Amino acid sequence: TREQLNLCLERLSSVLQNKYVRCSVRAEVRHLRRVLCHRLMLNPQHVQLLFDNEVLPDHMTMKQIWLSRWFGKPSPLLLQYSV
């Protein structure tokens, strides 16, 4: 298989449940947004993903976010979501 990486999701200013997420390195922001919608039982496009209070583009992969903002930081990668 392909590399897996570990995320921890945090609500910022209806909550999650299981905030630790493992996914494929190729998983993209858009995919995570939809999977989160499913778990929170929301319509599509009601969850945006953020790092350091800025919205992440739909086409960015989890691996990019790691290398660009989390390089040399301890696992898991910390992301936030808004509803």
């Binding site: 298989t1 590399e3 897996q4 990486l5 570990n6 921890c8 449940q17 299981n18 905030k19 630790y20 997420v21 493992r22 996914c23 494929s24 390195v25 998983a27 995919h31 995570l32 939809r34 999977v35 919608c37 499913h38 778990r39 599509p44 691996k63 790691w66 290398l67 390089f71 040399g72 930081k73 301890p74 696992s75 898991p76």
Partner: protein, 113 residues
Amino acid sequence: VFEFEFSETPLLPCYNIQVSVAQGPRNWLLLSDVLKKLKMSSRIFRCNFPNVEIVTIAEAEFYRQVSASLLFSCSKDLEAFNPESKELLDLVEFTNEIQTLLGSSVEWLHPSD
């Protein structure tokens, strides 16, 4: 199709390690990490999962493959290991069954909702 693991408990590190040339790199957990979380004996684990692959690997070799990875660029994610060690480590193959046993739920995202 994309596979996601959700857990309200921190995740064990997943290691991408080639054990056989024929197989290429595969995903594994350190068995001691699994056994610690469950406080379970090696014996009970192997009895209950007789067909989950466990392999032994030199800690030295383990260190080289793991440090090669950009995702293990933090010193903290490697400090439990010794680059020159001749000790053998046990790796358990990282299956959905193991993820489930360790308390997580596995979800599948398809092109549609």
